[PDB]
Every structure is written in structure tokens, then in C-alpha cells.
Amino acid sequence: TQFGSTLQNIIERQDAEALNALLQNQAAELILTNLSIQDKTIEELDAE
Amino acid sequence: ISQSETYRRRRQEWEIQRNNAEAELKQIDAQLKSLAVRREAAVLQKTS
Numbered sequence: 001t002q003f004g005s006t007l008q009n010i011i012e013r014q015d016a017e018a019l020n021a022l023l024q025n026q027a028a029e030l031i032l033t034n035l036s037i038q039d040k041t042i043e044e045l046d047a048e
Numbered sequence: 049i050s051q052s053e054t055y056r057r058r059r060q061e062w063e064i065q066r067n068n069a070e071a072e073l074k075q076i077d078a079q080l081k082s083l084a085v086r087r088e089a090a091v092l093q094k095t096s
Contacts, residue, residue, distance in 0.1 A: 044086050
């Protein structure tokens with residue numbers, strides 16, 4: 001049972017870290033999109 | 049003579065008004081460009 005408890009905790013951590021990796025990768029993807037948007041905004045001001 | 053000059057002066061006003069309209073057309077084209085750029089930004093925001 002001590003190993004079982006230990007295993008459960010390891011498993012929870014394994015999955016928690018996988019989520020953090022996912023979230024950071026997702027954040028990076030959205031930033032690239034936002035950069036295109038802000039760049040486009042600057043072009044808009046030049047049109048003004 | 050006065051009548052002739054009256055028409056001359058009238059013509060000068062017509063030229064000014066023509067030029068005002070020309071400026072309006074140019075500003076509008078610049079505004080259409082600006083809006084088109086904004087539209088692309090909106091499309092990117094939808095993409096985001």
C-alpha cells in the first residue's frame with residue numbers, strides 16, 4: 001500500500017506536468033497570432 | 049467687362065470646389081484602405 005500511494009502521487013504529478021507543458025505551448029501559439037494582429041494595427045495607423 | 053469677370057470669378061470658385069471634392073475622394077480612398085486593414089485584423093482576431 002505504501003508503494004500504491006506513492007504510485008498514485010507520481011501519476012498525479014505526471015499528468016499535472018503534462019498539462020503545464022500543454023498550456024505553455026498553447027500560450028506560445030496564441031502569442032504568435034497576437035503579434036500578427038498588433039503588426040496589422042500599426043499598418044492601420046499608417047493608413048490613417 | 050464686369051459680366052465677363054463675374055464669370056471668371058465664378059469659374060475660380062468652381063475650381064476650388066472641384067479641388068475640395070478631389071481631396072474628399074482621396075481621403076476616402078485612404079479611409080477605405082484603413083478599414084480594409086482593420087478588417088484583416090478582425091479576421092485574425094476571429095482566427096485567434
